[PDB]
Amino acid sequence: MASINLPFSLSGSKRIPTSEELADGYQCGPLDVELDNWLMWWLTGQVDGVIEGAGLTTDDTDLARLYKAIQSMTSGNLRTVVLTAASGNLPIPSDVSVLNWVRAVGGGGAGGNSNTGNSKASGGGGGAGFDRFNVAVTPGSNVPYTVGAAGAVNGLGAGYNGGAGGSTAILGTTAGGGAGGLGVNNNATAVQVNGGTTSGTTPEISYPGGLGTEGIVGTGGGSVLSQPTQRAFTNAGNNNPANSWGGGGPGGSDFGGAWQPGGVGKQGIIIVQYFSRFAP
């Protein structure tokens, strides 16, 4: 039989080793069951606690138990979580006390709208990202996370600035989403659109999102996961979106009497990691 459930004494009139029991091991008097009972129960109960603390069973014959289940504790049980819903409640398992390598990225911003003239429109900036380590969390439920929504594009026509991306926040740290691009009419160069920032509790490392350009190059800023995206000279509004999460669309271009609606900025995501024995 594998399972043993082995705290030995289990409330058997136990007794801590007194000062004389610590200056030297035992005494010339009789060896009482009371003290040896604790001297066995404490050791075996902590052994059992380590074994079963990683969702394992204490086998009497294995004698290894995944190297005291430490391999399951350290190497295994690493259950990463990626968050994509607009807003929800992140569950905390019972035994989890620390979240490690929490990464967040603000949503990027869509680019500007360009008409059939001569000058080009601007691309939206990229959202910001940060990493925090050794994040203390309480058992139960985590603070409801919020993510940065994808950069909305106003397809009502050319010359209308793109919508800015949403700002994500979790564990008391807010990642400002990238600002949307600026749409201008002919013979007009838009302004260099600033990207997102990090606000709130200072992260260990912060990545300010790439900021959008005027429109001569028209590249959308990236993020931790996203890279700059370049414009595409097309006459059918192919409007290739941001490459990855947090990036900003390249925006509209201007060539051959065609109007580009503008690039699309991808939303932001939340990454949290923790070692638990339960269902992630």
Add this chain to the structure above:
Amino acid sequence: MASINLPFSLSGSKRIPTSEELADGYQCGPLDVELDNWLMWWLTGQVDGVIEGAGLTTDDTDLARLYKAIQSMTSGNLRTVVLTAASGNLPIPSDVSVLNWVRAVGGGGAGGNSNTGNSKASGGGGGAGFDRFNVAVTPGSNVPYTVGAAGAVNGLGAGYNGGAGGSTAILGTTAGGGAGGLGVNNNATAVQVNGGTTSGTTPEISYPGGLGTEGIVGTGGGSVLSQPTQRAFTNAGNNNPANSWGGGGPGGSDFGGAWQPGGVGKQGIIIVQYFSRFAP
């Protein structure tokens, strides 16, 4: 007196303890070494199993063994293996049961070719990439790994498409490589080609490769580790290559009769991390 080799019983007439001896302590009657032999053999076997799990010699007087080799089990014994050969196998040591943070990058293609005209060529695409955390791996010999090839250059002459990029695959997940840039004649600008693509089993986090340009800006799309690289305005064919793994070619410009084949993208790599007491 460092090495002790201390499992106590080692076939010394062991026995499973009774249910009552787990409910209550030792019976007050005559002692039974048949029981205490197993009771102490189990504990010492667990402890020296922890000691050997990190490849440390069990000691009697040290009483720490670097926190029972746990300090060398979590912080130490961290092995990083960089796979670069296009064909090979990953030797998984015996004491490895789960592989975590399997960083993989695909190789990016090279840029196109432009003749002695006015219009430039498309920059090479970038290879995709992904990260998988806590991958289940059985001890022994792993399924052979495949890393992508570098960005081939069709150095035959101008006006020809660049070489395609090589894809990488490992553990049932494939990170496709970025297609090479298109070759162009004079008085015509290239059309951008998409970058790397994620395929196979769904990774926990994927980094799509930065795609190329039509040619006017002519940046070489980056990757997980590589950032975009612009072209070079030199008539000597300097055409500097991508910065790092997964990058693409900046492409060949077209000014003053320049025969620029463009840059050459390097190949992707696979980075894994596991915990072992053997050599990396």
Add this chain to the structure above:
Amino acid sequence: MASINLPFSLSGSKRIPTSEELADGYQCGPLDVELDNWLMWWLTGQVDGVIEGAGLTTDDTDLARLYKAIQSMTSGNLRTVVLTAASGNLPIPSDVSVLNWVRAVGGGGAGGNSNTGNSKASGGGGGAGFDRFNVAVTPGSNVPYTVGAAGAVNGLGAGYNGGAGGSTAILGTTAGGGAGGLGVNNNATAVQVNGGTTSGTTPEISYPGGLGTEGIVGTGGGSVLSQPTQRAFTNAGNNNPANSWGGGGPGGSDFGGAWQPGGVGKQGIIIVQYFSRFAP
């Protein structure tokens, strides 16, 4: 009475059991104090060392100590130290022998200066980076870390080479810094400037810094942390800097007879993680 001064014997006439005593269990002879002292002392002292080396206090009846305080050794006590001082020493705690994922990035270089003319100045290179995992050090003091100084803009006048940023180096590995931009006069544009490179003890992974353009594109230097930054087309010389550490100035700009000095090169930083009960 939480803490106990827990290791049981403490000079209580300990004698190691013989090899014959290790081959079998308890012998038919009478109970000897010198065996039952050591054979409990080693187990209980190993457990006490594990508990007290994790920064947790021994308890009598807790029976868990937060699962042997291993969570304080796997996830807890995960200490992150980022260095942003210009120069100085990096202290190593008394129990720290290995640092996890030592991350460094080279300093960035600002771009060149542009006068009032059709041509634009060239940008500055970006610092290089490298990650070293499972680096071995000694408890005590470490080599004085040398971060790269931020690349200051060269405001000496029109067409002057930009200021270069320092290179970073720590623990036998030196990452090249981002060279400054090249300053040229109107009706003329310089050539690309190379970025930093990884030198010293070749790490597991190296991030070569993003190099600037000839000047037509004028993108900022890139790095693993800092994204390339574009130039500002403004009449007041807004000189947008690099977003994060290691980036480079996008170089001097000009349109319609403007004088823009160009962006400023950001500095390099050092990131390390180690495990220790001592707060950083």
